[PDB]
Amino acid sequence: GIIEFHVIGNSNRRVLLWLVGLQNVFSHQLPRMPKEYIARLVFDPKHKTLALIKDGRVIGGICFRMFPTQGFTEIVFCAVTSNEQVKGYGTHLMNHLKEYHIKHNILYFLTYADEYAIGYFKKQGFSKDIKVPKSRYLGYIKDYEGATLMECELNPRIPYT
Amino acid sequence: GIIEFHVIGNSLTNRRVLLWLVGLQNVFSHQLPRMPKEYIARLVFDPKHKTLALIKDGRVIGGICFRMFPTQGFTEIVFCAVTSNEQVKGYGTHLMNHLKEYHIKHNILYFLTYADEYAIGYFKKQGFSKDIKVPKSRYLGYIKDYEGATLMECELNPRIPYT
Amino acid sequence: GIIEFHVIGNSLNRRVLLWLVGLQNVFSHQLPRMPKEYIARLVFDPKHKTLALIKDGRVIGGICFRMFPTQGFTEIVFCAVTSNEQVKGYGTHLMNHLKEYHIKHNILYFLTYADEYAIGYFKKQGFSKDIKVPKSRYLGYIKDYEGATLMECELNPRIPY
Amino acid sequence: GIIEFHVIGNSLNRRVLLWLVGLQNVFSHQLPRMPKEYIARLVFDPKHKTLALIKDGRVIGGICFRMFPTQGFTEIVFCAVTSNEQVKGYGTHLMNHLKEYHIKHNILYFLTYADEYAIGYFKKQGFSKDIKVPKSRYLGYIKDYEGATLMECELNPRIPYT
Amino acid sequence: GIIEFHVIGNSNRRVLLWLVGLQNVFSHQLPRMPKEYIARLVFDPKHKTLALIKDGRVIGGICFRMFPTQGFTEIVFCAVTSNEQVKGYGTHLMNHLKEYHIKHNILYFLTYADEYAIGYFKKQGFSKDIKVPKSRYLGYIKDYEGATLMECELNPRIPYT
Amino acid sequence: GIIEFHVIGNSLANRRVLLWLVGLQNVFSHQLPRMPKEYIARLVFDPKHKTLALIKDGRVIGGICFRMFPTQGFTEIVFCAVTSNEQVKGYGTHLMNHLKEYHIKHNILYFLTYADEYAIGYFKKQGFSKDIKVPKSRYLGYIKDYEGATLMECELNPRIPYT
Amino acid sequence: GIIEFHVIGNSLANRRVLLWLVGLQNVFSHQLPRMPKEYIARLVFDPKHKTLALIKDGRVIGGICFRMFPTQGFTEIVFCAVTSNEQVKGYGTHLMNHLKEYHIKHNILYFLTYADEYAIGYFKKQGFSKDIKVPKSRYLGYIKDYEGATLMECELNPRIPYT
Amino acid sequence: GIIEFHVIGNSLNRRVLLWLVGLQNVFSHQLPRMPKEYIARLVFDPKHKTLALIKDGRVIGGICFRMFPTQGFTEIVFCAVTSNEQVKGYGTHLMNHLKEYHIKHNILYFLTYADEYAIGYFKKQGFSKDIKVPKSRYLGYIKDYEGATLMECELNPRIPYT
Ligand SMILES: CC(C)(COP(=O)(O)OP(=O)(O)OC[C@H]1O[C@@H](n2cnc3c(N)ncnc32)[C@H](O)[C@@H]1OP(=O)(O)O)[C@@H](O)C(=O)NCCC(=O)NCCSC(=O)CCCC(=O)O
Ligand SMILES: CC(C)(COP(=O)(O)OP(=O)(O)OC[C@H]1O[C@@H](n2cnc3c(N)ncnc32)[C@H](O)[C@@H]1OP(=O)(O)O)[C@@H](O)C(=O)NCCC(=O)NCCSC(=O)CCCC(=O)O
Ligand SMILES: CC(C)(COP(=O)(O)OP(=O)(O)OC[C@H]1O[C@@H](n2cnc3c(N)ncnc32)[C@H](O)[C@@H]1OP(=O)(O)O)[C@@H](O)C(=O)NCCC(=O)NCCSC(=O)CCCC(=O)O
Ligand SMILES: CC(C)(COP(=O)(O)OP(=O)(O)OC[C@H]1O[C@@H](n2cnc3c(N)ncnc32)[C@H](O)[C@@H]1OP(=O)(O)O)[C@@H](O)C(=O)NCCC(=O)NCCSC(=O)CCCC(=O)O
Ligand SMILES: CC(C)(COP(=O)(O)OP(=O)(O)OC[C@H]1O[C@@H](n2cnc3c(N)ncnc32)[C@H](O)[C@@H]1OP(=O)(O)O)[C@@H](O)C(=O)NCCC(=O)NCCSC(=O)CCCC(=O)O
Ligand SMILES: CC(C)(COP(=O)(O)OP(=O)(O)OC[C@H]1O[C@@H](n2cnc3c(N)ncnc32)[C@H](O)[C@@H]1OP(=O)(O)O)[C@@H](O)C(=O)NCCC(=O)NCCSC(=O)CCCC(=O)O
Ligand SMILES: CC(C)(COP(=O)(O)OP(=O)(O)OC[C@H]1O[C@@H](n2cnc3c(N)ncnc32)[C@H](O)[C@@H]1OP(=O)(O)O)[C@@H](O)C(=O)NCCC(=O)NCCSC(=O)CCCC(=O)O
Ligand SMILES: CC(C)(COP(=O)(O)OP(=O)(O)OC[C@H]1O[C@@H](n2cnc3c(N)ncnc32)[C@H](O)[C@@H]1OP(=O)(O)O)[C@@H](O)C(=O)NCCC(=O)NCCSC(=O)CCCC(=O)O
């Protein structure tokens, strides 16, 4: 149906049910993390979420945490619901997220990828060469140990969307 | 007895809480004799200081005074004590665990603190470590420094329940 | 006509408004390979300021910059003097005002990237390739460009009056 | 006669206003190479406060400072004692008061610059050329007087200074 | 490419950037017009502008000024950006402007056209025979020595879009 | 059988008037079928158009939708219709008269209308004329132009009672 | 008797003004007895119409009803009358002289009127002309063109003391 | 000395009032065969504006005008500068300022009835006898003094006059 992207968060029913929608999709695709954890982070004020909507219904999104005081943006949760993967949705999601960030003058993503995920983060432009001083992000980015930290650098000249 | 925990603090915007804070200043000062009593009470009743209080039968029997630095990304452990006839019962670790839970819920996962010789052992068993991942450039001037004490650090795991 | 220097920006005034569009035009005209949209987005960003050089109510040049007190330097984003008034010292006065403005604001370091068409002008303004600012302090704060040369300028602090 | 301290500033009283002028006077006289008006814009800046030393009604000394609590330190801007009150301990009591004041606001580091003529006083007040504080924490905030040693003082909140 | 139309003006950031986008497209497509004149009118509040928005960015517009008291509108600027011309965009912009002017009780367009623009206005149902009296438009619309005054009369009983 | 006149219009209205406006838009739309019913609708509910409604047993049977241009010194006649089973009874004249008297009481003295081939003798019999004394500069681009229709004019005497 | 001039009308009255207006409604209709009293009354009390009243000994003895059309730059003389026991004494010429002075001070420099056969003499003596300098497009429709009545104009000079 | 321009008038502030009276003097004195009553009644009329030329406090000239925004033009009513400051560009700088003022208020036509001594000046200011504004549009809104020359000036809104 109509496909739409909304950057939504907690500061309205339509947004609220979308946020439960997202928390359902993040808990279900990322089972290794307590659903109570995903709920707090999704419904936190400082966290925003880019929501992919197919016909009223959440099917995917990205939860992030902008650190404009730090120069970068932390990518917290990335899921696309199982009957919607591998149709290039995750890419469209990352690009809207990229476009959103260049419009807000922020040019580095930082995220902790799991072994299963790294291939998709490559294909979005993320590298293992972390050019940000560890002193800049340690303690702000939620430091999963074992998970693999990656960087992305945006070019505010390219239209990502 | 009945046991309750409570994050309390001197608000600039109540009386149970007041007498509760007084009781903590009395515990901290008497269990921490080389801390001047006036210095403790200044910190406790300071607004940007919170204080997890441990209450047994309405009576303060311990607690941790801490100062959050969310902009910096870590919490300063300021005081903690358990009153003398309630130590070695596990109350000290229950305070720490609860303190750890509150701090996941507030998206902070780093504890800094200075320890004398006599407290260093306790903090290791709360899973602090001498190795400090946090940049000096981030905590210096915000945490009450202590020349002559160890700087300990603790890293919390948001995927874990502590209480 | 009489020359005026003003440090302006979007405040988050009709005369300042049309001046910011004037700057957006001489910036986007003299830096022709840069997206008009991008220059406009930055000129009108509230956290960027622009030293405008005014001659007869009309914009003839200026320097778009972005200060980083928390980091001790200022990023210089755009510098252009309009064509019919270049090589008249106008560029130098703009740079010299900027230096005066920053000494008074206790920032004594400029960081800029210089393409080959512009690097000489910056050398002649007291810039060097010798970046004394720790890389620790500027990554993720200055728009890292590849293929361009990062230049530094260190100001000399002055006791006013 | 009566000696008396007050932390004065220009916010948004005739007594306080003339007190400030006296402070600009004493500062500008004891710092003769400082432009008088640069001293003026500072004393009367809202973000600057001054610890005034009044003696029998009259400004004889002071320490002008700017607090940077979001950065954990205070910048010491001007110290001075009028010349016929120097070498009496007035300078030290002015400092010790400024310390006691800052313990109470949980700022525990002083930064300042020291020319030839006053570094010895600052060392007697416990300032060191070792700067514990991150250069990343003050480089864009404090006025640099290049040619004058930057010095730091770290405060112990557990001790009385008054 | 999601195209979309909007009648906007100066009384919101994206609207501001949208007008800058418009002032740009106008200057570049109408070079003999001073850039500052174009901006002075676009950001004048009695002047509205029908922005054509391809995939988020301005790629065309008509700056017009409505004169209800006088019973007509002034067509002030017309442009479609260079890469998007001869696709129909110019005619679609006129038709939307015509519908807006039906639903607003205004059924007369006046414009001055130089020789290169006369072809386009004839195609949009403009004519050189001006039935509005000089008494009604003169000194209200900005006249142009040597440009043809072109007139258009709309049918409120027609759908134009 | 009780017949009333009311000058109504869309105030920028209660249900009786709203329903009347609709009934007027219904009637105008049927007795004028070459007029887009969406155009009739948009005009009748315009806040600067008024309508002299002929009502019988609470029911709209006819009206004259007009547009007063007091700055220009005349009124435009927009729509004129009596329902079909009430025509040729003299309703359309009483409507014109009530409208004529309405306007001299409002110090407007000129009517302008466009009349197709099939409406011209109606207006002739209500005092309208093809000879326009109003200057083209006064009305052009203020009245809705209908190319191929005859512009008609009417001059009202304020020393006359019309009703 | 003490004579007075007062520009009055029905605003949006004062019981001394309101009785003056009927005093005028009387004098106008009685001196112009072939115009319906109703038409005179409606106008005198129309609020876009003012009246310059001539008050002798408190009673009304004449006046000039007028209508200022500033947007068009002219005023219309609509009624002029002096009580019968007070004609041929200079009253109609003072009333006009005041009307003139008043309009200079309001930056209006043209008077128009449609004079009947019996008025024309008076208007000429007040410097009125049949030669109309104001284009037809400015007054037509705004002032009523009675068949058989003579448009006459008066052009005022602001550098002249009229009163 | 210091020279400033000020569009002033009576709003229906004493330094303004004394400034208007200064204008009514200067006008009345440069235009002696015009009744001073009439000059004054205009200058202080509220539908009238006056662009004042202040040199060292003192009003040395100005232009009294009347904007007819509904009719699309502005009447020039009085132009004078003091007898001992003419022929220095003052009256031309005054009109240039009046031109810019009217561009921003989108009124791009001036009309004036000139006496024979004025005509040269308005022509240097770019006035001409070829009136594009239809009679219907200005007639009666401006008094047509017999013997006076109706002149017109069209302003170009893309040119910078000041
Ligand atoms: C990976 C996504 C989010 C993307 O879904 P998508 O729409 O299918 O992506 P697409 O545009 O259609 O395809 C893009 C392209 O990415 C490549 N790719 C390589 N590895 C993978 C992979 N594991 N999954 C999905 N795609 C992957 C595929 O080949 C795709 O096609 P392509 O090769 O480009 O032609 C989705 O498949 C999903 O929800 N997976 C399960 C959740 C997950 O594992 N998320 C990653 C971790 S989230 C985070 O920020 C960290 C949490 C903490 C931690 O991990 O430690
Ligand atoms: C440390 C506490 C508060 C803990 O009391 P508790 O309820 O009895 O603890 P528990 O859970 O029952 O047992 C914990 C376990 O920790 C072990 N342990 C090893 N070393 C120590 C040690 N030094 N102190 C307390 N326990 C210690 C004990 O064997 C306990 O049993 P376990 O090993 O688990 O079988 C208590 O002993 C006390 O009141 N101590 C004196 C107050 C004190 O020194 N607190 C820490 C310093 S305050 C601060 O934040 C630092 C200020 C800056 C500076 O000091 O320089
Ligand atoms: C470069 C400026 C802004 C300076 O204009 P100006 O008024 O002529 O300066 P001036 O005081 O009269 O001349 C002083 C001196 O500058 C020297 N110079 C050396 N190289 C150049 C050069 N490439 N362009 C202009 N001047 C240059 C001239 O020889 C002059 O020599 P002199 O000292 O008089 O003997 C102007 O020419 C201009 O707008 N040029 C075209 C646009 C441009 O390339 N601007 C500089 C790039 S913007 C930038 O690098 C900021 C960051 C951009 C990014 O991040 O990518
Ligand atoms: C330095 C002060 C302010 C101190 O006043 P005081 O009453 O004499 O202090 P005290 O407690 O009685 O004496 C304590 C001790 O200070 C020692 N000392 C060593 N060197 C100096 C020195 N250069 N000046 C003053 N005292 C100095 C004296 O020997 C005393 O020693 P002691 O206590 O007996 O062991 C005074 O001498 C004075 O007013 N001097 C003139 C102004 C001045 O030098 N101010 C400090 C310059 S920094 C400033 O405020 C400007 C900004 C920085 C910049 O310009 O870059
Ligand atoms: C005129 C427009 C805006 C329209 O372009 P467009 O998107 O290509 O329109 P289209 O529907 O795709 O094609 C329309 C059709 O109109 C015909 N035509 C005749 N002359 C022209 C012409 N000069 N340019 C474009 N088309 C023109 C062409 O045959 C076009 O294709 P078609 O007939 O459908 O096969 C465009 O060409 C353009 O951007 N031109 C540059 C600026 C400009 O020419 N503006 C018009 C005058 S600005 C004004 O309103 C008055 C300012 C005062 C003054 O000039 O003095
Ligand atoms: C014309 C009216 C509205 C009036 O009808 P009514 O109630 O019967 O009036 P009445 O007092 O009994 O007068 C009947 C009298 O009018 C005469 N007559 C001469 N020509 C016509 C004519 N063309 N149509 C209707 N009647 C006409 C008849 O011979 C009758 O003779 P009579 O006066 O009784 O001796 C009615 O017949 C009707 O419903 N007509 C259908 C709609 C219509 O044509 N309305 C007039 C035009 S709408 C407009 O305002 C113009 C919009 C723009 C445009 O037209 O382009
Ligand atoms: C006209 C007036 C108002 C003037 O009477 P007044 O107070 O005596 O004025 P005055 O200063 O003493 O006379 C100055 C001079 O006016 C001359 N005059 C020349 N023709 C006439 C004339 N036809 N009627 C009255 N006076 C006339 C008299 O001869 C006087 O002496 P003069 O000949 O100059 O040596 C008076 O006669 C009167 O009230 N008459 C009855 C009403 C009347 O006819 N008023 C004239 C206005 S007509 C009107 O308002 C409706 C026309 C609108 C329309 O329906 O189209
Ligand atoms: C005309 C002005 C106002 C001009 O002020 P200014 O500073 O002297 O003029 P400027 O800037 O130096 O420009 C001088 C230049 O204008 C040329 N010019 C040609 N004819 C004349 C002329 N008749 N008067 C003044 N200048 C005249 C002179 O050759 C000068 O040559 P230039 O252009 O400098 O090379 C001045 O001379 C003056 O105050 N004159 C006395 C009052 C006067 O005549 N005012 C203008 C009449 S406006 C009016 O109300 C007339 C009656 C209108 C009505 O019927 O309501």
From Swiss-Prot, chain C:
Succinyl-CoA binds at residues 79-81, 86-92, 117. The active site is at 75 (proton donor/acceptor). Residues 139-148 are annotated as: Loop 3. The modification N6-acetyllysine is found at residue 49. Acetylated at Lys-49, inhibiting the protein acetyltransferase activity. Acetyl-CoA binds at residues 79-81, 86-92, 117. Residues 7-156 form the N-acetyltransferase domain. Expressed in all tissues tested. Changing residue 67 to A: Reduced ability to acetylate and inhibit PPARGC1A. It is found in: Nucleus; Chromosome; Cytoplasm, Cytoskeleton, Microtubule organizing center, Centrosome. Belongs to the acetyltransferase family. GCN5 subfamily. Protein lysine acyltransferase that can act as a acetyltransferase, glutaryltransferase, succinyltransferase or malonyltransferase, depending on the context. Acts as a histone lysine succinyltransferase: catalyzes succinylation of histone H3 on 'Lys-79' (H3K79succ), with a maximum frequency around the transcription start sites of genes. Succinylation of histones gives a specific tag for epigenetic transcription activation. Association with the 2-oxoglutarate dehydrogenase complex, which provides succinyl-CoA, is required for histone succinylation. Loop3 is required for substrate specificity and adopts different structural conformations in succinyl-CoA-bound and acetyl-CoA-bound forms. Tyr-145 has an important role in the selective binding of succinyl-CoA over acetyl-CoA. Homooligomer; may form a tetramer of homodimers. Interacts with EP300, CREBBP and ADA2. Component of the TFTC-HAT complex, at least composed of TAF5L, TAF6L, TAF3, TADA3L, SUPT3H/SPT3, TAF2/TAFII150, TAF4/TAFII135, TAF5/TAFII100, KAT2A/GCN5L2, TAF10 and TRRAP. Component of the STAGA transcription coactivator-HAT complex, at least composed of SUPT3H, KAT2A, SUPT7L, TAF5L, TAF6L, TADA3L, TAD1L, TAF10, TAF12, TRRAP and TAF9. The STAGA core complex is associated with a subcomplex required for histone deubiquitination composed of ATXN7L3, ENY2 and USP22. This is Histone acetyltransferase KAT2A. The chain holds residues 497 to 661 of 837 of the full protein.
Swiss-Prot record, chains D, H:
Acetylated at Lys-49, inhibiting the protein acetyltransferase activity. This is Histone acetyltransferase KAT2A. The modification N6-acetyllysine is found at residue 49. The active site is at 75 (proton donor/acceptor). Protein lysine acyltransferase that can act as a acetyltransferase, glutaryltransferase, succinyltransferase or malonyltransferase, depending on the context. Acts as a histone lysine succinyltransferase: catalyzes succinylation of histone H3 on 'Lys-79' (H3K79succ), with a maximum frequency around the transcription start sites of genes. Succinylation of histones gives a specific tag for epigenetic transcription activation. Association with the 2-oxoglutarate dehydrogenase complex, which provides succinyl-CoA, is required for histone succinylation. The lineage of its organism: Eukaryota, Metazoa, Chordata, Craniata, Vertebrata. Residues 7-156 form the N-acetyltransferase domain. Changing residue 67 to A: Reduced ability to acetylate and inhibit PPARGC1A. The chain holds residues 497 to 662 of 837 of the full protein. Changing residue 115 to A: Catalytically dead mutant; abolished acyltransferase activity. Belongs to the acetyltransferase family. GCN5 subfamily. Changing residue 49 to Q: Mimics acetylation; reduced ability to acetylate and inhibit PPARGC1A. Strongly reduced ability to acetylate and inhibit PPARGC1A. Expressed in all tissues tested. It is found in: Nucleus; Chromosome; Cytoplasm, Cytoskeleton, Microtubule organizing center, Centrosome. Loop3 is required for substrate specificity and adopts different structural conformations in succinyl-CoA-bound and acetyl-CoA-bound forms. Tyr-145 has an important role in the selective binding of succinyl-CoA over acetyl-CoA. Residues 139-148 are annotated as: Loop 3. Acetyl-CoA binds at residues 79-81, 86-92, 117. Homooligomer; may form a tetramer of homodimers. Interacts with EP300, CREBBP and ADA2. Component of the TFTC-HAT complex, at least composed of TAF5L, TAF6L, TAF3, TADA3L, SUPT3H/SPT3, TAF2/TAFII150, TAF4/TAFII135, TAF5/TAFII100, KAT2A/GCN5L2, TAF10 and TRRAP. Component of the STAGA transcription coactivator-HAT complex, at least composed of SUPT3H, KAT2A, SUPT7L, TAF5L, TAF6L, TADA3L, TAD1L, TAF10, TAF12, TRRAP and TAF9. The STAGA core complex is associated with a subcomplex required for histone deubiquitination composed of ATXN7L3, ENY2 and USP22. Succinyl-CoA binds at residues 79-81, 86-92, 117.
